Specification:
The complex is a heterotrimer of chains A (about 100), B (about 10) and C (about 280). Chain A has about 100 residues and is mainly beta. Chain A is about 0% helix and about 45% strand. In chain C, strand 2 (about 20-30) and strand 3 (about 30-35) form a beta hairpin. Chain C has two domains: about 5-180, Murine Class I Major Histocompatibility Complex, H2-DB, Chain A, domain 1 (2-Layer Sandwich), CATH 3.30.500; about 190-275, Immunoglobulins (Immunoglobulin-like), CATH 2.60.40.10. The two termini of chain C are about 40 Å apart. Chain C has an eight-stranded antiparallel beta sheet with strand order 4-3-2-1-5-6-7-8, with helices on one face. In chain C, strands 9, 10, 13, 14 and 15 form a five-stranded antiparallel beta sheet that branches. In chain C, strands 12-11-16-17 form a four-stranded antiparallel beta sheet, with no helix packed on it. The chains are: A mainly beta (about 100), B little secondary structure (about 10), C alpha+beta (about 280). The interface of A and C includes residues 22, 33 and 65 of A. The complex binds sodium ion. Sodium ion (NA) binds next to loops of chain A. Chain A: It comes from Homo sapiens. Chain A: It is found in: Secreted; Cell surface. Chain A: This is Beta-2-microglobulin.
Chain lengths: ~100, ~10, ~280
């Protein structure tokens, strides 16, 4: 009936401070398809975020990739914020370059 | 190419 | 190598106003090549890979007409299903449909499929014989009888074994520079001192295509599953995929552990070990 999203936040390339990259938030395993995904920089919503066209897996659960360009630094914090009907409050997953 | 004959359930 | 063509369709009803939200996507293997989005301005099937852009106006007109007919069928189905399940006209519901074909290394037909779901649950699916239907419940049984009467499985079998396969071979030929190129994983290992007497070793596989891959850890040449973490394969966003597998080990014992990578792009499996100087 209603499946909660699994979230991964990560960079397209291994991150190096000061080097141009792409921040990804991969949301998957959810049902129904309506979902709110925001990429955050220091807790503030990033404006230029694009996303993939909705598709789904064998078990019918949906998946989407949200992405934007970013340049990692020592001081900035990045994260992805997801809200879905299965969630009480928005779920925030911080970006860690080690994962 | 997509299928031509999708039918109602 | 072995290849597939698959189409995915999702319609979500909008009870407040207007027609359902409809999204269709086409794939060859793990590459998206076409899309249709009812919310997009063009109202046309759109290319998403450079090798499909060479198809002429007759191709795009035909794909647009068919995909719009899919959208209308799902709109009517959403109403039909609401009636079969005795549901109100106030809620949002979803229909999903996936179909496609697989070919082997010789590009000959291996298998076909056509599956339909209502509210994320199996509804009706074509069996592997391409002649009969699996109806999950009594509402789907009503559909199965209608489809048996309308020769639906015959028309699908003709498409899946013929048309689907013939166009897949054309796409594989036109997009050979990418569709037939394997991108072997670019691997490396990282070390993260996680607690007082332990460290996490993380084996990374990046920039690979197709998405299928196996990452496994061994300890002294035997499979290690305890204290391991494997993330689901994820898209890099440039058409390639990524995955990592980690193991928590006692510090000083890193050399007992080896990460093994298997992928279509690797003629021999890869083995990685943490070198103590790094
Ligand atoms: Na919520």
């Amino acid at each position: 009936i209603q499946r909660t999203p699994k979230i991964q936040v990560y960079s397209r390339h291994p991150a190096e401070n000061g080097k141009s990259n792409f921040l990804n938030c991969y949301v998957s395993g959810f049902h129904p398809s309506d979902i709110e995904v925001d990429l955050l920089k220091n807790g503030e919503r990033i404006e230029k975020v694009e996303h993939s066209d909705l598709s789904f897996s064998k078990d019918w659960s949906f998946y989407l990739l949200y992405y934007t360009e970013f340049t990692p630094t020592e001081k900035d914090e990045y994260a992805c914020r997801v809200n879905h009907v299965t969630l009480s409050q928005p779920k925030i997953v911080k970006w860690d370059r080690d994962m | 190419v997509v299928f031509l004959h999708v039918t109602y359930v | 190598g072995s290849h597939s063509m698959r189409y995915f369709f999702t319609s979500v009803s909008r009870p407040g106003r207007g027609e359902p939200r409809f999204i269709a996507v086409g794939y060859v293997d793990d590459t998206q090549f076409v899309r249709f989005d009812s919310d997009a301005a063009s109202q046309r099937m759109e290319p998403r890979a450079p090798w499909i852009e060479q198809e002429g106006p007759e191709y795009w007109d035909g794909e647009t007409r068919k995909v719009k007919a899919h959208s209308q069928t799902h709109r009517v189905d959403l109403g039909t299903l609401r009636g079969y399940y005795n549901q109100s006209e106030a809620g949002s519901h979803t229909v999903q449909r996936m179909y496609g074909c697989d070919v082997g290394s010789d590009w000959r037909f291996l298998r076909g499929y056509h599956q339909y779901a209502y509210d994320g649950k199996d509804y009706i699916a074509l069996k592997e014989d391409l002649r009969s239907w699996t109806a999950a419940d009594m509402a789907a049984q009503t559909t199965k009888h209608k489809w048996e009467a309308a020769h639906v499985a015959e028309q699908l079998r003709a498409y899946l074994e013929g048309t689907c396969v013939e166009w897949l071979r054309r796409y594989l030929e036109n997009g050979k520079e990418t569709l037939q190129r394997t991108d072997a994983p670019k691997t490396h290992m990282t070390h993260h001192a996680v607690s007082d007497h332990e460290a996490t070793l993380r084996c990374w596989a990046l920039s690979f295509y197709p998405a299928e891959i196996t990452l496994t850890w061994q300890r002294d040449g035997e499979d290690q599953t305890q204290d391991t973490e494997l993330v689901e394969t994820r898209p890099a966003g440039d058409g390639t995929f990524q995955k990592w597998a980690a193991v928590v080990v006692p510090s000083g014992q890193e050399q007992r552990y080896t990460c093994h990578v298997q992928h279509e792009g690797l003629p021999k499996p890869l083995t990685l070990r943490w070198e103590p100087s790094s």
